[PDB]
Design a protein around this ligand. Structure first.
Ligand SMILES: OC[C@H]1O[C@H](O)[C@H](O)[C@@H](O)[C@@H]1O
Ligand SMILES: OC[C@H]1O[C@H](O)[C@H](O)[C@@H](O)[C@@H]1O
Ligand SMILES: OC[C@H]1O[C@H](O)[C@H](O)[C@@H](O)[C@@H]1O
Ligand SMILES: OC[C@H]1O[C@H](O)[C@H](O)[C@@H](O)[C@@H]1O
Length: 444
C-alpha cells in the first residue's frame, strides 16, 4: 500500500544525557537527582546506576559514525544541566559547554541536524535542594540554564525542545515515587506539573531571543492511546480520567489555557498553584509539538491506582519486555487527535521504540525480529498520518543504542544498536540494519 515519506522528512534516533553519557564526575559535572536516586534500595530493578552507562561522553565520535551508518539526517539528545551549571545557577562550567560544542560541531560536520532537549530529568541535586519542581522558584532556575546554553549553541542548533515528558517529571518523580527525586504525594505532583508548564512557557521567549529566524521550539509530551476495558459507565469514566491524567493534563493548558475540568474537580482544584497570568505564559506559541508514543493502555474502574480509582487490563495481543501493548494504530490515533483538536503547525515523533530480550549470536549478530516488526508497524502508521494531511515532519526512534532505562536499569534494551556493557562494543542490530534502508530510501 505505502512507500515514500515527504522529501524533507527527518529520520532520527534519540537519546538522553544521563541514560548514555556516563563520566558522571568528569570535567566539573555535579550529581544530578538521578545520581542520588540510584543509591536508593529498590529504585533501580537491577541495582545499577548511570555512572558509566554507554560512556558516550568519551565515545560520541564513534556514536556519530554509527548514526552515519544508520543514514539518519537528525539526532535528538539532551543537555545535562549539571555539566553546564554544576552549582545549579551562577558559574558556567566551560568544560561542560565544550562537550556540547564538540558534539554539535561533529554532528553538523557529518550532516546530522541536532535536535536539543534542554531538560531530560537530570536536575543538579544542589539545585533540587533549593527548588524542587513543586517550588515555583524552579521556573527562574530553569530559565537561567536555558539562557546560558542557548546563548552558546543557538548559532548551530535551530531545533530546541524545552522539557521532556512533563507527566513523567511530575507524576513519576513526585506522585508515584518511581523516578527521581522519588516522592509520592498528589499535591507535590500537581505543583510540579504546573511549574513544568510555566518553565516551558518562560523558556520559549529566551530560546527565540537567543536564536534567529530559523529557530524552532516546543515541548515534548508522552501520549499513549487509551482504551476503556468495557462499555460499563464505570469503565468509560475510568478511561476518561486516565486519558485526562496522561494525555490531556499538559496539552489542554498548552493550547486552551485550562486543565481538564472533570479531573481537576476530582483532584481538588485548589491543589494546583495557578497564579494570574500563568495560562498566558503556558500558552506562549510553539513551532511544533513533539510526541513520545509507545503503547495502548486499557483501563477499568478499580482501586489499583487509588488516586484515579483505575486498574490496567492487558487485552489479548503482543507485549514488549516492558509489558507494554504493541498497538501501532494508536500512533495514528494520537497524531490525528492532536491534528484535529489543537492544529499544531508541525508534529514530530521524538520517541518511539520497543524493548525485547536481545542476544549476540555466535556470529556476532543481534537478530531482533520483534523490534523490527514494532518499528515497521509504527512507521506505517506515521505514513498513514502523513497521507491524511497531518503535518508530521520527523520521526526519531528510541533509541540509538541500549542504555540506562531508568528504574529498569540496563536490563531493558531499546536500542537499534546493541551495547555489550562489559566492553562498550556497539553492534548494529537487525532492526538497525533495516532502519539503515528506511532512512536512505526515505520510506518502507
Ligand atoms: O555523580 C556522583 C556519582 O559518584 C560516583 O561516581 C557513583 O558511582 C555515581 O552513581 C554517583 O552518583
Ligand atoms: O518508561 C517511563 C515512562 O515513560 C514513557 O514516556 C511512557 O509514556 C510511560 O508510559 C512510561 O511509564
Ligand atoms: O472523589 C475524588 C477524590 O477521591 C479519589 O478516591 C482520589 O483518591 C482522590 O485523588 C480524588 O481527589
Ligand atoms: O521508558 C522508555 C523511554 O520513556 C520515556 O519516553 C523517556 O523519554 C526515555 O528516556 C525512556 O527510555
Amino acid at each position: 500500500e505505502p512507500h515514500r515519506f515527504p522529501p524533507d522528512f527527518q529520520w532520527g534516533v534519540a537519546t538522553s544525557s544521563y541514560q548514555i553519557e556516563g563520566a558522571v564526575e568528569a570535567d566539573g559535572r555535579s550529581p544530578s537527582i538521578w545520581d542520588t536516586f540510584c543509591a536508593r534500595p529498590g529504585a533501580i530493578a537491577d541495582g545499577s546506576t548511570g555512572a558509566i552507562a554507554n560512556d558516550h561522553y568519551h565515545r560520541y565520535r564513534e556514536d556519530i559514525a554509527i548514526m552515519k551508518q544508520l543514514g539518519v539526517n537528525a539526532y535528538r539528545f539532551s543537555i545535562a544541566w549539571p555539566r553546564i551549571l554544576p552549582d545549579g545557577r551562577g558559574r558556567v562550567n566551560q568544560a561542560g559547554v565544550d562537550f556540547y560544542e564538540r558534539l554539535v560541531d561533529s554532528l553538523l560536520e557529518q550532516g546530522i541536524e541536532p535536535y536539543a532537549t534542554l531538560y531530560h530529568w537530570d536536575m543538579p541535586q544542589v539545585q533540587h535542594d533549593r527548588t524542587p519542581w513543586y517550588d515555583r522558584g524552579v521556573v527562574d532556575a530553569f530559565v537561567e540554564y536555558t539562557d546560558v546554553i542557548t546563548r552558546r549553541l543557538s548559532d548551530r542548533v535551530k531545533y530546541w525542545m524545552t522539557l521532556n515528558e512533563p507527566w513523567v517529571i511530575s507524576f513519576l518523580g513526585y506522585g508515584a515515587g518511581e523516578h527521581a527525586p522519588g516522592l509520592r504525594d498528589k499535591e507535590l505532583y500537581l505543583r510540579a506539573a504546573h511549574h513544568v508548564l510555566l518553565a516551558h512557557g518562560k523558556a520559549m521567549p529566551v530560546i527565540r531571543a537567543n536564536g534567529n529566524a530559523q529557530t524552532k521550539a516546543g515541548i515534548v509530551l508522552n501520549l499513549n492511546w487509551v482504551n476503556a476495558a468495557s462499555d460499563s459507565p464505570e469503565d468509560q469514566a475510568a478511561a476518561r480520567r486516565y486519558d485526562q491524567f496522561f494525555n490531556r493534563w499538559f496539552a489542554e493548558p498548552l493550547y486552551n489555557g485550562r486543565y481538564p475540568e472533570e479531573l481537576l474537580e476530582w483532584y481538588g482544584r485548589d491543589l494546583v498553584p495557578v497564579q494570574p497570568g500563568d495560562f498566558d505564559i503556558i500558552t506562549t506559541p510553539t513551532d511544533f509539538l513533539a510526541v513520545n508514543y509507545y503503547a495502548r493502555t486499557t483501563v477499568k474502574a478499580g482501586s489499583t491506582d487509588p488516586m484515579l480509582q483505575v486498574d490496567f487490563v492487558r487485552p489479548p495481543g503482543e507485549y514488549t519486555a516492558m509489558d507494554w501493548e504493541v498497538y501501532p494504530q494508536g500512533l495514528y490515533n494520537i497524531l490525528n487527535w492532536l491534528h484535529t483538536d489543537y492544529a499544531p503547525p508541525a508534529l514530530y515523533v521524538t520517541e518511539n521504540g520497543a524493548a525485547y530480550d536481545d542476544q549476540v549470536s555466535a556470529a556476532g549478530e543481534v537478530d531482533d525480529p520483534q523490534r523490527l516488526a514494532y518499528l515497521e508497524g509504527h512507521f506505517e502508521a506515521a505514513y498513514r498520518a502523513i497521507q491524511a494531511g497531518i503535518p508530521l515532519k520527523g520521526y526519531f526512534v528510541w533509541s540509538l543504542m541500549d542504555n540506562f532505562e531508568w528504574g529498569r536499569g540496563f536490563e531493558k534494551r531499546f536500542g537499534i544498536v546493541f551495547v555489550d556493557y562489559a566492553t562498550q562494543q556497539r553492534i548494529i542490530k537487525r532492526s538497525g540494519k533495516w532502519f539503515s534502508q528506511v532512512t536512505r530510501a526515505n520510506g518502507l
